[PDB]
Ligand SMILES: CC(=O)SCCNC(=O)CCNC(=O)[C@H](O)C(C)(C)COP(=O)(O)OP(=O)(O)OC[C@H]1O[C@@H](n2cnc3c(N)ncnc32)[C@H](O)[C@@H]1OP(=O)(O)O
Ligand SMILES: CC(=O)SCCNC(=O)CCNC(=O)[C@H](O)C(C)(C)COP(=O)(O)OP(=O)(O)OC[C@H]1O[C@@H](n2cnc3c(N)ncnc32)[C@H](O)[C@@H]1OP(=O)(O)O
């Protein structure tokens with residue numbers, strides 16, 4: 001019953017570890033799943049990058065899996081507009 | 096001989112008006128030709144744009160020819176780097 | 191047996207695959223016919239029995255219709271555009287580039303891609319390759335649906351009918367895409 | 382048995398092999414130097430690995446041991462060398478086949494026979510295919526002078542391991558023959574170690590014809606017609622066309638037959654190119670390139686045959702006509718004509734020197750009859766002086782050669798690369814020329830046409846307007 005409910009809540013069929021962690025920490029697991037869907041596996045970032053983001057002109061390399069390494073460089077931080085949004089000028093994988 | 100020397104100095108065969116203006120103002124005409132080679136026909140810009148450049152998030156339209164209008168938007172002015180260069184993030188013709 | 195329905199008195203969107211399998215520039219011939227030129231004398235097309243059949247071709251139209259949203263046309267800012275190339279690939283791009291703001295005013299088309307080859311199976315393989323190689327981020331596309339349709343055995347046999355999509359619910363199962371560059375950039379920007 | 386392939390190359394050829402591998406359902410592994418970290422081919426593969434750490438980037442791409450180490454740790458079943466780096470290298474292929482990995486290339490005996498020009502000429506003589514009347518081996522300077530005496534000028538000095546016209550010099554008199562021999566010697570020790578200079582008879586305005594050869598493990602060897610690469614500057618190919626529209630079909634058939642029977646005599650496998658020198662209805666063998674060529678795209682366009690896919694499938698041991706599905710030699714179709722142009726960073730107003738800098742504008746054409754094999758030319762790409770000058774290969778194909786010329790002129794005008802200089806105005810001048818349009822261009826056509834180097838002034842009003850706006 002819990003596993004079917006969780007497969008409804010998260011977008012896939014959970015493992016036994018996911019089911020058991022959803023039992024103990026239901027809202028914490030669901031918030032973790034939402035953050036996984038939004039920001040992805042932030043566990044792969046290095047800790048200074050994890051806690052502080054990026055500086056201007058910094059180059060970081062994030063190995064997301066074996067053989068794949070994201071080359072990320074922050075070129076410019078835009079001024080905030082009237083809607084409160086900033087445009088950040090990244091150079092992801094050369095582009 | 097003045098026309099041949101001007102054809103040497105500027106990269107094309109000059110007209111009679113160009114030759115006669117080179118005779119009266121030699122250095123001034125050559126500086127004007129250098130600025131034409133570098134900045135182009137800046138006479139097509141409107142006067143506030145000609146004198147003050149471009150504001151952030153400003154959209155201007157420059158008609159360089161009949162049927163050709165340049166859509167120019169300044170999106171972001173970058174911070175100067177160690178060589179004193181700034182990167183200006185333009186949107187020219189949608190790109 | 192066959193039945194007439196209607197005649198489109200204009201060039202079609204899918205004229206590209208016709209000119210790929212025949213070699214005959216349809217739009218160029220359209221303009222030359224509007225110039226009053228003769229089809230076989232001035233334009234230079236051969237006779238009917240000499241019109242070539244250079245293999246097979248497939249046109250896929252990549253649009254902003256989100257198949258996980260009832261094929262509604264998505265709008266928004268395109269932040270990533272990578273187009274494939276190589277042997278057997280033809281691109282007729284509309285307004286699909288990085289930074290283009292997709293408006294709800296016009297048609298949802300982003301880019302027409304055509305794959306052509308000597309064999310139909312090679313055309314199918316090339317179209318699967320270019321649908322995976324295509325990268326459009328910032329707006330949803332119909333690319334997962336096209337990948338599903340290309341994968342289907344009813345399509346690849348050539349025996350698809352006009353009821354094939356409506357009677358195959360397995361076309362609407364879409365694998366989860368990681369999209370790890372976008373999420374990493376989003377987290378970096380947030381922090 | 383193959384499930385994963387490594388490409389020991391870079392640029393557009395790596396992307397081409399990646400696309401062929403994805404069409405064939407195989408996994409792709411890229412390698413890249415540190416200075417090539419922003420290359421497109423790195424991000425077009427399933428796995429990418431840094432190679433040659435600390436070396437120069439060209440030397441990093443020649444790091445044989447590192448490439449096999451990456452291929453072994455990545456679980457790649459095979460290595461495709463592409464062209465230009467280790468495709469013709471006997472040592473690399475020997476180590477690859479010794480490591481248990483499939484080498485996507487010809488056999489080792491093919492490599493060391495066709496690698497050296499005098500041994501390839503000996504093999505062609507054994508296949509009785511006629512070649513240029515030249516020395517029977519690497520003669521000395523005095524023997525070169527003796528050959529200049531008995532057979533008479535004009536002669537041409539050529540090294541037995543020269544590439545890209547490096548070890549090749551020309552001679553008109555005795556003193557210039559000495560100078561050319563010394564310069565070829567210096568270029569041979571400098572870049573290839575051993576100097577094995579021979580001397581060949583110089584032909585006045587020849588036509589450079591290349592025949593594409595596909596051969597499998599079973600012994601079936603076919604030719605995918607021929608390519609006319611006569612349009613050259615300083616003996617470097619500029620524009621290649623296919624087929625030879627300036628030659629009669631029967632003469633082209635004779636050239637193709639000589640090429641396939643040479644490859645049959647040597648028992649050739651995988652893709653290969655046989656270079657022929659054509660002068661008033663006779664042909665001379667020069668070299669066999671034991672690799673896929675840059676201009677294979679126009680051959681694929683005029684034949685419909687995927688050369689890289691067939692290369693991988695031959696490396697799988699598949700039959701040419703049963704498993705790959707290629708038809709018989711008489712059934713190989715000729716789907717019109719095609720033209721290849723290589724858009725590079727060479728500045729024709731600067732002596733064709735490779736320009737470097739940041740590309741700030743890139744627009745690529747599309748539509749009917751247009752094929753793009755882009756390298757690293759996107760907007761924001763910083764062109765480095767480390768690698769070759771190529772930006773984007775573009776091929777235009779049509780039923781008629783005139784329509785191919787018109788499409789390629791449209792393409793060269795539609796292309797927009799700003800920030801670095803390109804050879805596009807030179808290509809426009811060559812395309813507009815009536816000798817190229819007729820197809821009777823020779824190897825001396827560019828060097829004897831000074832009007833190709835007259836370039837109209839381009840306004841470039843967007844760049845100048847943006848520059849003035851930034852200034853103010
Ligand atoms: C679709 C086809 O078949 S393409 C064949 C020709 N290619 C074209 O692009 C046609 C449009 N014309 C042009 O782009 C140029 O005027 C050319 C190619 C004829 C001349 O090139 P240049 O001298 O170097 O640039 P030019 O000074 O004339 O124009 C300046 C800018 O106005 C742009 N422009 C060109 N046409 C228009 C237009 N109708 N409206 C607004 N801007 C335009 C140009 O793209 C150019 O911007 P860019 O730096 O990104 O290239
Ligand atoms: C040349 C051809 O034939 S391409 C055919 C399709 N195959 C490929 O593209 C191989 C490269 N792999 C990918 O691009 C993706 O991983 C896909 C298409 C397989 C999966 O799609 P997604 O889930 O949405 O992206 P994914 O999470 O896996 O990867 C995240 C980023 O790492 C990039 N990336 C992919 N491969 C590499 C690599 N070897 N090194 C560094 N970055 C890479 C992806 O391009 C992606 O960036 P993007 O937003 O611009 O698209």
Ligand SMILES: Nc1ncnc2c1ncn2[C@@H]1O[C@H](COP(=O)(O)OP(=O)(O)O)[C@@H](O)[C@H]1O
Pocket residue numbers: 513537543544545546549581582583584585587588589613616656658667668824
């Ligand atoms: N003996 C000769 N006489 C006249 N032209 C020649 C002769 N040998 C070569 N050429 C021309 O010079 C070019 C040599 O290039 P090539 O030797 O094929 O380069 P690479 O050594 O890199 O393969 C050929 O395209 C050919 O047209």
Ligand SMILES: [Mg+2]
Pocket residue numbers: 656667668
């Ligand atoms: Mg050669």
